[PDB]
Amino acid sequence: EEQQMHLNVGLRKIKETVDQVEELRRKVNRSTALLKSLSAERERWEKTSETFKNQMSTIAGD
């Protein structure tokens, strides 16, 4: 549970970073790098969170 809480806190922190980068946008290449890191991190952490619900399923028998 705490390992998923850490992931949720990290996701919220990444949202804060997204807000900061968007505020800064309002260099261009650095912003594009931040958006691509945004996409990569969102995908990886979303799939990690999806996987986390699988371990809770297979924890009792293990």
Side-chain angles (χ1 to χ4, degrees):
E1 292 179 351
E2 62 85 13
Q3 192 165 98
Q4 211 156 11
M5 183 278 288
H6 180 77
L7 184 143
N8 303 339
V9 170
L11 265 172
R12 183 171 29 248
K13 181 66 178 301
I14 292 182
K15 297 257 166 44
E16 295 292 326
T17 306
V18 173
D19 298 341
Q20 267 198 51
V21 170
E22 187 50 63
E23 196 287 327
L24 190 146
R25 177 69 273 172
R26 313 278 62 91
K27 319 167 189 176
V28 192
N29 57 4
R30 309 293 184 86
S31 305
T32 61
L34 269 295
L35 276 296
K36 74 172 301 153
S37 160
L38 176 157
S39 302
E41 293 296 326
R42 294 322 180 141
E43 288 147 353
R44 186 181 78 237
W45 288 43
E46 175 63 30
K47 66 176 71 176
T48 317
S49 77
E50 287 292 329
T51 305
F52 272 114
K53 269 78 75 177
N54 300 340
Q55 279 91 23
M56 293 180 183
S57 186
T58 174
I59 193 167
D62 186 12

